[PDB]
Ligand binder design. Structure first.
Ligand code: DH4
Length: 498
């Protein structure tokens, strides 16, 4: 008979158990049943429902009490089964996901993959987050009764629980998403969607009452806003668009344009600054998040050569984060618009896209990826949750297969685009100077406002040689605190405690 394997555990960067296995003890003529009532406190309910496990769950007391009366009950034995436990619950609901009961649907799927024998004795399966993406590595090989089951591999995530909780705290009541990342590794220090729910509700098996709650909730907690949230990336895109315009030579380090707070299609487009920024280079256009300047560059570069370059930053593309719940959003093209809407591409479509607006939609993870790329001077990093896997009691570390590069690393285009962001935070004309008031570290940021308007901030530090990057969005503005406020708080927590 099949011996179910113990599911591999999930841990934060510092080995803090995030997903655990709790032992549930089970007991397994109608005279015998009444005889057990005093020995295990078998209730009128446990016999009614029992109509195979006679009593569940047993308490170590009731077990120990049956254990000494084992001889007085023939064949009846105590069985130690396991249930997934999520200590930190709602904190990780999205990134860790959860295991839930296998239904006849999950069966059919296992059947055609030819692994149904492995799940013979297994009741729960990874249905979300790391639990789903790594279900394979977390399940283990099944054993037989005596050929022992090979226990599922432990997964060490790059997550920092301390930070992950701290973010959830800061996003309270705000439909929001945050993706802290170590840009040196691609490692996701934190991945937070608000609102969340208890992952533990699913382990036993979720009530259609409880699910229709999460399903029909206005705030839509079920959605991982970090990876499945499609938002206009708005001004966050400008630094990458900047680098793309430089590489394409459609602008240069110093390319003065005059902003009157307006830009018409040579049909006007209002800059955020009602009476404009005046004489603008990219460095200043980024610093002050000037629309006019980028409205122009959009037109000069044109949809096809802009779309192409953003596709290199991974917009419209799956980031390759180790999660099965992900959207690619859309980096729009003529090709796309024609197919999709069955109308050709107008120039009034290229202008919105120039300020990460229009048809352009992005996932916080996409935004987090594109920033890491900009930080590493075009050496693309895949956002990864997995830090290492326990393979034969050895931690085997994550190793990136994607060696991708874009343009020349030695091109001083990254340095200027980044310097702009250095300005957005440190210099007095900067959009986010208010938020990085007196940072012991030197932070670089690019704020953004989409379409109540979404409020966005990508940011990284210490600029001098960065070890953190953040992509935060607060759907329809912050519940209360500013996106810039929270970005400060997050960079504080990591860089002051480092
Ligand atoms: C970037 O996305 C930029 N443009 C956004 N909008 C155009 C002007 C009307 C306001 C909303 C749409 C915004 N970037 C933000 C920011 O917070 O950085 C501003 C305020 C500079 S405008």
């Amino acid at each position: 008979v099949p011996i179910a394997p113990s599911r591999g555990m999930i841990f934060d960067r510092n080995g803090t158990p995030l997903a655990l296995n709790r032992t549930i003890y089970q007991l397994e003529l109608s005279a015998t049943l009444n005889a057990l009532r005093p020995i295990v406190d078998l209730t009128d309910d446990d016999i009614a429902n029992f109509e195979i496990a006679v009593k569940t769950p047993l308490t170590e007391v009731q077990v120990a009490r049956f254990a000494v009366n084992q001889f007085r009950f023939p064949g009846i034995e105590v069985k130690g089964y396991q249930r997934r436990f999520y200590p930190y619950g709602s904190a990780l609901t999205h990134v860790i996901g959860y295991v839930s009961k296998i239904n006849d649907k999950d069966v059919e799927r296992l059947d055609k993959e030819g692994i149904l024998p492995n799940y013979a004795a297994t009741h729960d399966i990874g249905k979300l987050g790391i639990e789903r993406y790594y279900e394979s590595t977390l399940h283990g090989k099944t054993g037989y009764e005596e050929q022992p089951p090979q226990a599922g591999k432990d997964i060490y995530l790059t997550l920092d629980l301390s930070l992950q909780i701290y973010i959830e705290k800061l996003l309270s009541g705000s439909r929001a998403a945050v993706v802290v990342t170590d840009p040196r590794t691609g490692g996701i220090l934190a991945l937070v969607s608000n609102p969340s729910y208890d992952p533990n509700l699913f382990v036993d098996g979720i009530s259609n009452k409880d699910y229709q709650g999460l399903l029909n909730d206005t705030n839509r907690p079920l959605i991982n806003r970090a990876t499945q949230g499609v938002y206009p990336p708005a001004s966050t895109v400008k630094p990458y668009i900047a680098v793309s315009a430089l590489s394409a030579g459609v602008i240069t380090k110093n390319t003065s344009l005059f902003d009157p707070g307006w830009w018409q299609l040579p049909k006007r487009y209002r800059d955020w600054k009602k009476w404009g920024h005046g004489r603008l280079n990219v460095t200043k256009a980024l610093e002050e998040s000037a629309d006019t300047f980028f409205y122009q560059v959009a037109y000069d570069m044109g949809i096809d050569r802009l779309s192409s370059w953003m596709s290199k930053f991974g917009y419209g593309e799956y980031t390759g984060i180790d999660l099965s719940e992900e959207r690619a959003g859309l980096m729009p093209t003529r090709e796309w618009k024609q197919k999709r809407h069955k109308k050709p591409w107008y120039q009034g479509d290229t202008i919105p896209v120039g300020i990460g607006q229009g048809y352009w939609t992005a996932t916080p993870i996409q935004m987090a990826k594109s920033l890491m790329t900009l930080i590493n001077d075009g050496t693309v990093k895949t956002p990864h949750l997995l830090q290492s896997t326990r393979i034969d009691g050895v931690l085997v570390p994550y190793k990136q297969e994607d060696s991708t590069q874009i343009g020349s690393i030695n091109s001083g285009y990254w340095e200027i685009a980044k310097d702009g962001m250095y300005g957005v935070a440190n210099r007095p004309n900067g959009t986010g100077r208010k938020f990085f008031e007196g940072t012991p570290y030197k932070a670089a940021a690019k704020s953004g406002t989409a379409q109540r308007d979404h409020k966005l901030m990508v940011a990284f530090a210490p600029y001098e040689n960065p070890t953190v990057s953040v992509a935060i969005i607060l759907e329809n503005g912050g519940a209360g605190p500013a996106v810039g406020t929270i970005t400060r708080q997050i960079l504080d927590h990591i860089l002051l405690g480092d």
